[PDB]
């Protein structure tokens, strides 16, 4: 898995060399940012259920046809509502993984790789998840660099969907 530490190791290993002072400074950079990252991860985790429910309702509010139209890809029944809240929880959970890992590794590996193909295949609109992520950004209640960290990874997810 890609993290600031394993990326530094992979770079040194590619060049067949010991870790450089540049890479040790890079890892301390992660160490220095970790306080803000962990604050964001704790808060997103503690309010995960309320954040997931609110994000799902925000999507339905913005795109009411998703609770209207018949179809396997929509949330007009109990099955589709469970699928949607499950998906949004996946986004939130993996964002906290990225905050804790110190990089987008978990997002890239667990969610973004193949994301385009999955949404195309199952007729899932990227705009739905963008709206859900925008809601999480607006309601995580963080400030300072904790909010910066949270918003950086949320924006990364939104970019992956745009």
């Amino acid at each position: 898995m890609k993290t600031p530490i394993t990326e530094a190791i992979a770079a040194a290993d590619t060049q067949g060399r010991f870790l450089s002072n540049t890479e040790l400074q890079a890892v301390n950079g992660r160490f220095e940012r970790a306080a803000a990252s962990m604050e964001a991860a704790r808060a997103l985790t503690n309010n995960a259920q309320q954040l997931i429910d609110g994000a799902a309702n925000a999507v339905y509010q913005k795109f009411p046809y998703t609770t209207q139209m018949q179809g396997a890809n929509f949330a007009s029944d109990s099955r589709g509502k469970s699928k949607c809240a499950r998906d949004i929880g996946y986004y939130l959970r993996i964002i906290t993984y990225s905050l804790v890992a110190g990089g987008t590794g978990p997002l890239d590996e667990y969610l973004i790789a193949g994301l385009d193909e999955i949404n195309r295949t199952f007729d899932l609109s990227p705009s739905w998840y963008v709206e859900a992520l925008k809601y999480i950004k607006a309601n995580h209640g963080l400030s300072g660099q904790a909010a910066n960290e949270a918003n950086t990874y949320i924006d990364y997810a939104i970019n992956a969907l745009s």
Partner: protein, 172 residues
């Protein structure tokens, strides 16, 4: 590979679970003790040449059959390859030390090494003897109280020793 943070995250994703508050506390502690970890990596790295050279010199002193003609480390090409192996193992031990996890050392260095040495005829038991000499030298350098903030690096030193012992066991 995995570091200490990726290990927890990967296991949690397998169960589909958010990290608990206790897991978050534990990774915050890893960050808190990270400065000591960086010193250990920097001290081993900064002394890599002497750690390798002294351990190899002592090895050949104790095992002269390695360097006599017909020995495995005889000729300068085989000597250079032997010294290289010493350095490779030390390098992957410093990788595992930075990561706080042995996976990079097992995956990219130790796995298949006994079978590689068996095919070549490299005496794996003597490699293990050289690895143990590097361990003792590296640990003494890491634990050296001169020119560093006094503190407790016992858990770190125990970790680093386990990486060296892992490498020695993989070829002994």
């Amino acid at each position: 590979m995995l570091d200490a943070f990726a290990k927890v995250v990967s296991q949690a994703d397998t169960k589909g679970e958010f990290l608990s508050s206790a897991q978050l506390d534990a990774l915050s502690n890893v960050v808190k003790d990270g400065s000591k970890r960086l010193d250990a990596v920097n001290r081993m790295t900064s002394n890599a040449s002497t750690i390798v050279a002294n351990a190899a010199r002592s090895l050949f002193e104790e095992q002269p059959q390695l360097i006599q003609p017909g020995g495995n480390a005889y000729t300068n090409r085989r000597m250079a390859a032997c010294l290289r192996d010493m350095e490779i193992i030390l390098r992957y031990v410093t990788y595992a030390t930075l990561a706080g996890d042995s996976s990079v050392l097992d995956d990219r260095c130790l796995n298949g090494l006994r079978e590689t040495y068996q095919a070549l005829g490299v005496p794996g038991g003597s490699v293990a003897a050289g690895v143990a000499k590097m361990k003792d030298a590296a640990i003494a350098i890491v634990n050296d109280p001169n020119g560093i903030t006094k503190g407790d690096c016992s858990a770190l030193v125990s970790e680093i020793a386990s990486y060296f012992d892992r490498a020695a066991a993989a070829v002994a």
